[PDB]
Symmetry: D3
């Protein structure tokens, strides 16, 4: 009567990473190419392959149960809706470790920027007018907008705007168009959100199972099994944060699980205190 409906961006780098995570969590399915409803083989789950821009909208209107989407698109649509008294409520279940990107202010290379107040009175081009307003209201700076749905980087050289606010990762497009990033106003990752309202306890249990699995996939990526050699224990313990007590062994030899990746800096700190520092990977876990 009702399977769990999950909205994923149809095509994009964000799509593969979302499909990959559902599969790493033991959700089996095949995309029957260009068909946009995908039925899970082994679980009572439907995938809807939609434009990312529509996903907050769908989640907010209860029309799907779960949704994978950029924090940037989500917050922009929430604000566009709050501006029209449209329902804008949802529950955030988990932040992904992917889809990273940032909304940044950019100006022409040949231009001085001491801070946000240097934009007071200038026109700014953006595809994220709401997130730009939120930032400039917070900095108390007045500006004009120039709304373009893309090719934002055109606007300054084209005499359309004094500056822009765009998504950025590399800065290739910026250099190409005579611009430099000068201010991060929003840092986004993908996020997994849930429609508002009540859930059948079966469907509740399913989402809980899925989430616990996602937690495990992340914890295995991050965590590491560390073995080292003597008798300077408590300081070493502090230098390697983790959940459980380290087991201390025979000839001292310490075995334990880090919660974070071991960095070179940390390894170097340990030699400065320790010897035979090993880090083994962890394929799978559940605390």
């Amino acid at each position: 009567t009702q399977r769990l409906r999950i909205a994923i961006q149809k095509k994009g780098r964000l799509s593969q990473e979302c499909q990959e995570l559902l599969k790493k969590c033991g959700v089996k399915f095949n995309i029957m190419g260009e068909r946009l409803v995908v039925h899970s083989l082994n679980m009572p789950i439907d995938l809807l392959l939609v434009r990312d821009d529509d996903i907050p909208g769908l989640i907010m209107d209860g029309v799907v149960d779960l949704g994978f989407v950029g924090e940037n698109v989500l917050e922009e649509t929430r604000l566009d809706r709050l501006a029209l008294n449209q329902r804008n409520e949802f529950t955030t279940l988990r932040r992904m470790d992917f889809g990273g990107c940032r909304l940044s202010i950019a100006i022409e290379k040949d231009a001085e920027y001491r801070g946000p107040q240097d934009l007071n009175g200038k026109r700014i081009a953006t595809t994220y007018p709401q997130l730009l307003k939120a930032y400039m209201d917070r900095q108390g700076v007045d500006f004009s907008t120039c709304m373009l749905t893309g090719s934002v980087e055109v606007a300054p050289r084209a005499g359309l705007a004094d500056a822009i606010a765009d998504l950025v990762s590399t800065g290739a497009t910026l250099e190409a168009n005579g611009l430099k990033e000068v201010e991060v106003i929003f840092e986004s990752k993908a996020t997994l959100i849930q429609r508002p309202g009540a859930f059948a306890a079966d469907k509740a249990a399913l989402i809980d199972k899925l989430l616990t699995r996602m937690h495990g996939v992340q914890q295995a990526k991050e965590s590491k099994y560390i073995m080292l050699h003597v008798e300077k224990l408590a300081q070493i313990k502090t230098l390697l944060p983790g959940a459980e007590d380290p087991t201390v062994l025979p000839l001292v030899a310490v075995h334990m699980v880090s919660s974070e990746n071991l960095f070179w800096e940390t390894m170097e700190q340990l030699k400065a205190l320790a010897s035979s520092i090993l880090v083994l990977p962890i394929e799978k876990m559940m605390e």
Copy 2:
């Protein structure tokens, strides 16, 4: 000291290449330097702006560019979205292109009955072109709900999001893939060349006029052909009828057609007893 003529063309898409091709066939020289979105003409006082197609009517309507290449569908949808918010919406149409053809069509599920528009009365319809859909349904006097999606419209029926859809179509591939059939053409679009409203410096006026006359000539050369054939003298008046064109045939008949010869026309000519039908191309012309 003066602002160059600024022309907006879609940055990336089918429509982009065909527009760049035509400016070059009209003797406008320019080279695209990668992801740079302002392009300066080498030999003419012209700038190109490589923007999203959806923003072009917007730009033209706000006078911020001079000329714009855009789908008749995007243009009419944005004119209506704007008239609904008392925003500018005025522009002048210079010329319809012989490219960018496509149609907005209503589609429903394959195994479902459609006698005519009235069968949609009260159904919810998903579309990226809410205004053009409204225009059509008001003309047919049928009431319906909308469901706005920014893309992947074809998802909506199978997903239980809407009873039907209104999408761009050519082949039907996406429709068949998603369990739908086109049942009703509501808008037929080609690309068009529009001009911002208001006054033009007579230099810039003269330039647009030169460009238009050249565009006419590049189209006339595509359409026109030099034809040479042998016929029975008796069949002359009939042959004349079969080949519409501007000038009289010379004497063996030599002449220039205004339309492309189809096979069917050539077969008609052999039937009149004409022989050695040649069609030579015309690279360039000006009546």
Copy 3:
């Protein structure tokens, strides 16, 4: 079936060139990707996108009306069938100017070959055992076979056979595997064949229309409009071969005419040796 059914190889260089020719002849259709029956929008025609290997078989069993296929696959299947008294009759409508390739005998680079008789008693690997037999029987030379359905070029170095008979265009694979082409046994192009038996006169008329159009597409590719500059006219006429040249008005000068073949440099040079202001214009479309 009441629509004309045409078999085309599904995917391959041969596929594009076949679709292209049907479209140049005014047959409109869209491949709805991975769907293997394609219905024409504007003509009573179905396309079946099948393996090339099955097309002679389908044409011979009347199950399709027309078929585009390599002359090599066609003749091999005809012979495999004649060997099992299976129906192997069909009608060839036209040879294509595409799908060119050749079955060639290849041996190891460091090996001597004075002619076919140097293969007498040797084992030969091929995916075309029938065409190989036809060749060797014609040369009266006895040999063993080693049948492999591909990667034929492996056989000598692998000690499977003394030589091979493979399709060739470049010879990349041959050099890579230590071999040289030494003898062309079969030259193939694609060909358009028709099932045997009777046709409804409507369906007959349709195939005839299509063929006349294909003839015109080819004739326009080959032909050229030539204009040049009084004695030696009859000789010039001979040098440029299907109509009288119209004799120019402007003595010192003159000539306008249509060649049936491409003008080659050699021919142009011959003309200067006799002529001046030699022009060649293309012909987009024609019907003699």
Copy 4:
């Protein structure tokens, strides 16, 4: 002085997975482009990159020593050969954990199938006529065949046959062409077979070394080092949930090696018994 000759499919899914396994077993070699005989650098082994369809043929004619091939192609060729009294004997050394796929009967979507008997008298298209016959004889149902070398999915919509028997995984091709899978007739994996007859004891020892290593490569894929905390209550139950060879070692803490992959379901079972800090470490290489 003849090296051990191993046949692997030249190009396909099955190729990479076979090359990968030879390398994981310490056979070094480099593919030099379109070259089809590949010599091992460090072992007395040649690889032959041939069409998969020819591999059972080669193994059965003793012309190669070992062969990697789909169980489906192998059984079809054994039967096609037994039907022509050609040599069809070989020895199966080991079944691979890759190349999974299944031959399935498919019919048109909007058509009823209660079971095999619904096919009695229908024509069926397939590239695997023998495996289809084997299945239908077992179910005692009579049918016609329509042999196609590929694009089988065309046949029903094209009016060439009532149903088909094709390889299937997702169903994409089937949906695209108006068909539904309704009956699995053969489940295949890749398999490693040996030519029949005697082996020199050196070459025997080498195949045995290779097999023992393959066993170890598989055992390392399957096996995992698991570390967890549990109540001493529910220990015997935990033992049952993690099958392996050795007893688990046990301050708190259980260390052991599983013989199977831990699934999420099993990990969830363990948390339910009240176990905590469940780790699974990979094993690159092993030998019991």
Copy 5:
């Protein structure tokens, strides 16, 4: 014994050279990374070599003809004149391809009124000889920094005040904080011949090939033009197109006449617009595949 022709093995210059030999009716197929290539239908061998070695090979008589950038030719001529090595050759024809330009570039945030602003600055280049030729001609002293590539590194790295590189996009310059400020050499590809005497057969062959290349160029440039003009305007139209043969004229009533003729250049729009202005009509331009005066 055959005609030996050197062409750059791989590069934009390679395709355009192979294309031209084929358009001239020389048949051959490249079998991958095979570098000595025989023509099927003509007594001609192709050598696929590095562009930098081609002037060298032609100058040492080891090949007969060579396709190469004017820039690498002049750089090697000078490198050789500096070592009293043979630097003599004959130039047969300038190509209408292989365009590129050696330019001086300096840091964006720096003042440059002209070449004299380089006096005493260090300059990086892959073309040390052409750089010297330029600086001698402007009478300016400078230091060099020779690098075989990645020239654009030098200024940002504090290796050099300026650079002289091949320049095309501008992207690399902007990326590295530089601006082109001065063109020192504009190159096209050229076809050169080894020095010495030729067997008259081999002479005749090169002459045939050259005449064919002339024809391929003349067909690119030329157009068959058909128009209507007032008979009074004909002589004037003739004057406006010095690129023309004498037109064949036919009457149509007697006001206008129909003119058919071959231009030597393409008609620009501007010229076509000039013709409408004289009161000509129905100006058509047909392409020409192949031709020979």
Copy 6:
């Protein structure tokens, strides 16, 4: 002021060098064809230069460290010693990548050994390394210096033989030649400009080197767990001279014991087979991501 490192701009050698700096915790992103690259998290500049210029730059002190083929380093050292130019530098570490070999090749159709080259003309892009080789074999030859497409020379009648870089024989077979003699086997190397550093910059190079050592040691090393008879333990220890002292745990019973330890090399199958032969069982090898 900051540490300047030269790496080949584009080539297989480039990726492997960038990869190693990142595996050593140096953060940076290449913004297209920008050639001076600043590290985000360390006082380190990267220069993306042509490989041929790297020895030159290191030798002229203009950069601090340089990643480069042993072959181009030795060729430029010799080109320079021939012009009394400074050719001094310090070698920090040999890489386990950038393998390739300069080989002599002649026409397929007689070569008994190097003396068969006496008096023949030879084409190469490495004229110095060719001279070094021929001097070492005491053989005289003519040269033909070309910057590339060396394999042309014999078929073209320019030269009797060639000396080229080789990996596959493809180009050789294509052009009617056979490799007959390896004259130089190269790997990439990490070299340092000559002179004094400043103890900050000294400390940094030392940190980087120790990290590179650790990345290599983790590639090579393995955590091995096995069962053996207690009697066989000392013998097993001997068989793995690559080992730490094993932690040994008794089972259940006292017959077999369980041994956990770290090899310095990977275990070959052959070694694992040797261990089963001593009557060890349940030989497991786990990977090691990182170590020190």
